[PDB]
Design a protein around this nucleic acid. Sequence first.
DNA 1: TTGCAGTGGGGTGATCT
DNA 2: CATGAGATCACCCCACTGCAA
DNA 3: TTGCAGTGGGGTGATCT
DNA 4: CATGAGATCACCCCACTGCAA
Lengths: 82, 76, 75, 80
Amino acid sequence: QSRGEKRTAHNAIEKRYRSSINDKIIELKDLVVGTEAKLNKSAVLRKAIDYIRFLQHSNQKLKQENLSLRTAVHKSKSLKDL
Amino acid sequence: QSRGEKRTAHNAIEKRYRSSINDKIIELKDLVVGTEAKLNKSAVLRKAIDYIRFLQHSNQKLKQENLSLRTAVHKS
Amino acid sequence: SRGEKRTAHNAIEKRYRSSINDKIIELKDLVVGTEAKLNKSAVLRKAIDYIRFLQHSNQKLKQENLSLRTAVHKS
Amino acid sequence: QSRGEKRTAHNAIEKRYRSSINDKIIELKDLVVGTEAKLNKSAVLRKAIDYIRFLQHSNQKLKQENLSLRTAVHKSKSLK
DNA sequence: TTGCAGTGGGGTGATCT
DNA sequence: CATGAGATCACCCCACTGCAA
DNA sequence: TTGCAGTGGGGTGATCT
DNA sequence: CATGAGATCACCCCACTGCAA
Ligand SMILES: [Mg+2]
Ligand SMILES: [Mg+2]
């Protein structure tokens, strides 16, 4: 590659670099405000951060409840002379 | 007010902007791989995307399960 | 035993290699010190140059001491 | 370079390597025992080491002497 | 009402891998 | 990161030399 | 009088640069 | 070590948009 060639190649490289990021921001955008909405990059990332924590918290609550529900039906089976 | 004076000023505005995004990718990073690691931006995003989807399905599945378990409780 | 003889001599050859290598390490400690990392030939190149350097420095000093003593005597 | 070529090359590189050391051990030999004498590698280096130390010690001795001679000459006039 | 901050696209150079 | 290659080192094997039993 | 350690040459793979 | 080259990042400059004064 000559200087101009490196440049031109690098620009195509950098184009691929940008999509590697911008394409994932769109993916995150669709996950947090949906495919139809329009939202700016930092806002999408801000929503993605809080959505993840929300989902993480929910997951914990959902699990705590699943165990309780399971412990409940299990106990329902116990007929033992009390 | 010179063009260059104006380019320089906006340059400071653009760094603000760039950091509005970068600071946030670092936040996502700390959530997916933690603080000690080093992971490029696109990989932080890829992980965050997959983590969200993973949690989304994990949560939906627990919800489905919890429904039955709850109804089982009823039908008992 | 061709082999056993080899193994045994191999130990002899290591002792030998070490007889040269440990000296290069000493020469190295002398010319660039202990913390440095320097390859064998540079250690030797330096040693050679260092000796030549001190040789000339000491000659010059001896001829000058000569002249100084002559002066003192011739006074 | 194929393994075969790399091999052949390496042997010539290693020939150059050895010479870069051996050629110097003989430069040292000549300094410690002379052009004509023959002494083995480790004894040449042992001699080089001790010779350097001696050259170092001598230089210090010589400098001190040089100063004393110089301080001598001075007084040899500086007598007020 | 419109001129700047904000926002984003694309290019470059330095540096990394 | 990859390839490419010369450099550096330890160690291999071989040859031989000379001294200590 | 001679085998065995010592010495040195060159090759080679592993690794560094 | 030396290319070589893609990837990564920050910053550049440019264009445009929307809102605060
Ligand atoms: Mg960016
Ligand atoms: Mg050697």
